[PDB]
């Protein structure tokens, strides 16, 4: 996160750190708890991940230093990538992790509501992007979970900013015209959380951008409301 500040413990209890153990254990991506055995994240996080066996989901974490060999984690039973996904820049950058065990909900870890289908016509004015990603293009994974308040940008405005790309209505952009606050390397997969009527909603999944926090280059996010049917298809299968 560029231009953000340290989160407070328990502030984003749906936020998870997805680690890989191959070849060495390190933070791979962010994710969000959406159900008691479900993490919503970005499909591009799994480029070259050949097995769910190398993945570890840690919830209730503020600091990466809380993670040692004796720290409890959730094993991943299955990786579900949207079958239309080709690359982040083309959309469908969404994946679900089915966990091997159930997350016990508490003040440190709980789910975030998915947006409502009717709420596709609501203006979100209180949106935050969180993660352990870089604070600048050449940096490193941050110890403390960072947060940044970012305004949503219309599809028309985002399309003007990305000449040569196709910004679809299955994408949602966020950023200041002058830059300064954005997601960066390591934040992918994490949430873009918006508060509406005192309830937080998972509006976006951090996906891609041209560099980090540049003037007139909004961050591009998977527009979660456009995937509610797909999430239910996958999590509510009979």
Ligand X SMILES: O=C(/C=C/c1cc(Cl)ccc1-n1cnnn1)N[C@@H](Cc1ccccc1)C(=O)Nc1ccc(C(=O)O)cc1
196: tokens are: 């509406």
CA distance 85 to 30: 18
229: tokens are: 């049917």
For the range 165-169, what are the long-range contacts, defined as Cβ-Cβ under 8 Å and sequence gap of 24 or more? 165/89, 166/90, 167/220, 168/91, 169/223, 169/226
Nearer to ligand X, 8 or 87 (CB): 87
- Residue 73 three-state SS: coil
Can residue 206 be called a binding residue for ligand X (CB under 6 A)? yes
What x-and-dash track marks residues 143-182 binding ligand X by CB under 6 A?
A: ---------------------------------------x
Can residue 209 be called a binding residue for ligand X (CB under 6 A)? yes
Nearer to ligand X, 172 or 231 (CB): 172
Report the residue from 187, 201, 224, 226 that binds ligand X according to the rule CB under 6 A: 187
Name residue, tokens 């502030």: 11
Q: Does residue 168 have a cis bond before it (omega within 30 degrees)?
A: no
Q: Which region holds residue 48: left if phi is over 0, alpha if psi is between -120 and 50, else beta?
A: left
Can residue 220 be called a binding residue for ligand X (CB under 6 A)? yes
Can residue 43 be called a binding residue for ligand X (CB under 6 A)? no
Can residue 39 be called a binding residue for ligand X (CB under 6 A)? no
Can residue 185 be called a binding residue for ligand X (CB under 6 A)? yes
Known binding residues for heparin are 160-163
Residues forming contacts to ligand X in the complex (CB under 6 A) are 26, 28-29, 44-45, 133, 140-141, 182-188, 206-209, 211-212, 219-221
């Amino acid at each position: 996160i560029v231009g953000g500040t340290a989160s407070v413990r328990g502030e984003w209890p749906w936020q998870v750190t997805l680690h890989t153990t191959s070849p060495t254990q390190r933070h791979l991506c962010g994710g969000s708890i959406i159900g008691n055995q479900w993490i919503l994240t970005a499909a591009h996080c799994f480029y070259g991940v050949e097995s769910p066996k190398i993945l570890r989901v840690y919830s209730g974490i503020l600091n990466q230093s809380e993670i040692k060999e004796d720290t409890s984690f959730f094993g991943v039973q299955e990786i579900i990538i949207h079958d239309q996904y080709k690359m982040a820049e083309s959309g469908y950058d969404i994946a679900l992790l089915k966990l091997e065990t159930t997350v016990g909900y508490g003040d440190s870890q709980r789910p975030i509501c998915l947006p409502s289908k009717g709420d596709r016509n609501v203006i979100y004015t209180d949106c935050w992007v969180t993660g352990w990603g870089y604070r600048k293009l050449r940096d490193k994974i941050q110890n403390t979970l960072q947060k940044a308040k970012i305004p949503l940008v219309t599809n028309e405005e985002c399309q003007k900013r990305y000449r040569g790309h196709k910004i679809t209505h299955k994408m949602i952009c966020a950023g200041y015209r002058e830059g300064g606050k954005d997601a960066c390397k390591g934040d992918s997969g994490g949430p873009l959380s918006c508060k509406h009527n005192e309830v937080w909603h998972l509006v976006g999944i951090t996906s891609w951008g041209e560099g980090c926090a540049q003037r007139e280059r909004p961050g591009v996010y998977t527009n979660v409301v456009e995937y509610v049917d797909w999430i239910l298809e996958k999590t509510q299968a009979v």
